[PDB]
Amino acid sequence: QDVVLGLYYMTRDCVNAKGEGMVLTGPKEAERLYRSGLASLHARVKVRIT
Amino acid sequence: TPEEKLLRAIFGEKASDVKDSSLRVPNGVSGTVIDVQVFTRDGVEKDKRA
Amino acid sequence: EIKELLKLGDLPTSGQIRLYDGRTGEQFERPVTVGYMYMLKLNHLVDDKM
């Protein structure tokens, strides 16, 4: 229960709302999430997947 | 046992023909005594504390 | 009438309220529910059950 709602909340693509497709490379995005500005359930957005 | 007989002989016998069966507070719990009570047998030397 | 009681003393007529982490101090994404629930400590409990 607890963890799964957790990972479901980590997906669930929400349109715009501090979204926009500002692209980067994985781990750097983590700095983006903590440092606000961008939301988390947006937007969609593109990044480099290795 | 012989070894024990030697042992008390080295540290003082005092081998009383008595045992031990005192009421002790069980390991773990802890609190404060709020009331003691003594019901003496009808025909028994009542105690000082009693 | 519960909403009606949410006024008078001034309170968010939704039960919802935005909370802050405390560790990070950062706000939680969604407004959580905050109120007063009459709880009671049952018997059973530890110490005994161990």
Add this chain to the structure above:
Amino acid sequence: KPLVGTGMERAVAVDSGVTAVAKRGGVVQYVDASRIVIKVNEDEMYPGEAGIDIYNLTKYTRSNQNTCINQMPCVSLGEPVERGDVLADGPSTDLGELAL
């Protein structure tokens, strides 16, 4: 006292002997953690055989489940009280109103 209640718990406490309800309503003469004495006042008995009504109220005793069952005075001295209201409270209750 419990916030969200039912109004019923004021009955539970006083219906149970756990709480000391005034036998005859009058005026409190002496309050104490040890006891409470009330002076009948408004209409005593048929004989003029003294007013007063003494309530000893038990304190800090053990329960069948080893829980502390003790009574506490919720009424102050020199306060008027009628017949059938809480003078001394009990364990897990709040002046007439039950609190678990």
Add this chain to the structure above:
Amino acid sequence: GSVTEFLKPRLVDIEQVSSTHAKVTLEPLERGFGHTLGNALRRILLSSMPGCAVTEVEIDGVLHEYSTKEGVQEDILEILLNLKGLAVRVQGKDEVILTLNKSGIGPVTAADITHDGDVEIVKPQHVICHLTDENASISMRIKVQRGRGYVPASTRIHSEEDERPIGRLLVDACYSPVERIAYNVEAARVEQRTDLDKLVIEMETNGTIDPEEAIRRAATILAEQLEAFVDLRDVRQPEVKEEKPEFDPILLRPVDDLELTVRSANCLKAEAIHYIGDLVQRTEVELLKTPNLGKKSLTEIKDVLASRGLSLGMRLENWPPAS
């Protein structure tokens, strides 16, 4: 060293709304910092703060904390709970014993305490008792200490006062003097730049401590703790304790363990004999030349020493190793 820009924070108007509530605004602040320090300070204040709190109370005619007293509407536990919220502020001590005598009909507050020259009582209007009959009289020696962070009586099982009388009642201790701590960032109208904030720190205390020595002691703890974040030598512990007692461990215990008379105990305490490691190596020649130690006292020693297996006045020139 020559890098970075950065700014500095500084105290502005400390609006004292009341004796408890307080507001300490910090204006010279940037954007990131004003939100970071908010949590650091909030935690250290809602925890790592000093203050004072009652620890012990000895009441006349009251053994345990479950009894009552004639003329007292409230029972002993309740009076122990009321003394929990004593807003005390001691000058320059670590331990004080405020006496509290009061007789006659009427409520006994923090005022009926003996007004000491060092103790500063915030609210003398504070409830503690409620005597009923005019012939009722009480007197309690209260003890107040200085510390930090909860720590009840349940922590000190018996690690204080080897004897500690029947009448001494242990009370829990709510040390920290900060009830609630909040803060809002807010954009600061600093007549200078444009993009700066002013960390407003809404505060609620008990009045036993001022917002000055409070925020300074707080930030000071953060600084001292950040002090280790500088260099990183990664200092390890040597450990390796020695596992080989050269002598019987019993020689380490004090003469109190001998369980002897008071006269003999005072003598050993006067001849500079603390541990049994000195009594075990002291002859009867030196025991006779001891003030107030006759035949009865000397017989007591040899009987309380021999029974433990030890003798009197042996020799062991190995006293003491070896820390």
Add this chain to the structure above:
Amino acid sequence: TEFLKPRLVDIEQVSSTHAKVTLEPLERGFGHTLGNALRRILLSSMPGCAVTEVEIDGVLHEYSTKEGVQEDILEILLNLKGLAVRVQGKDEVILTLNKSGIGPVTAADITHDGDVEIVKPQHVICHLTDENASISMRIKVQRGRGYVPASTIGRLLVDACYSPVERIAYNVEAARVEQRTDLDKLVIEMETNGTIDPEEAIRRAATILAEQLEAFVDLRD
């Protein structure tokens, strides 16, 4: 009377960039407070130089395409975000990149400046397909603070990485002190680039945090 100091300190560098640091002796919440503090310091309040503006010839807007290049303008700017720059003593420096032919367009193809030091010279930025392909651009490097996004003719904006720290995580983990019981031991995991080592990086953050609050210290006793 006061407080205690963290004594047992361990540091294992899972390379030059990735490392883990653990400090065991810490009181309640301090591990987390110092955690959030140092995390919030390392993720923005850290210096470091990164690409902020890019002016490519033939490319004026970001939604354009380049000829002879396997990677479009967006992918190119993205690779430029991964350019670790260490400038000697300037708050701004302009760089020029001119290169033609086939293969990987590395950072070694950038004009070797005296003041500017490129940490990773093999950092692949682009891919040229045919021999007749060529690219020339002006990459403006600035001295900033934190993470600058797109929120800030021929001037292509790129998200500025005014930070040498890629990611920061931290754990609580109860410490088993042989005297107390309610103590925590902070485990800080840092993932950085090449501009600065985790060793001096964390010390820098602690010092930056030290500049603030210090005005409220005083000594004497």
Add this chain to the structure above:
Amino acid sequence: SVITVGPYLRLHQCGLPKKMALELFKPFIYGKLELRGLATTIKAAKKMVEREEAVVWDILDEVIREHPVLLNRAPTLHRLGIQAFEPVLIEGKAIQLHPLV
């Protein structure tokens, strides 16, 4: 003992109470004590742990190191009713468990 969730645990670990684990590995603590030193003899160890003497707890941290303790719940329907974990000392009187199993 009553179980409680322990998020900070791993998948091969469980929260085993101090006083609980002390009395449980009594025969192991004794042996290791007389083994190292500390206790002059076997009866010395008993009096040494009966008087929980600081140093004893560290030796306890030693004996439960890689000594698996297997857990069990009341209604054991299948094989996964009893599963083994690595003992983790926790200041408490309750037994903590991994929220996955």
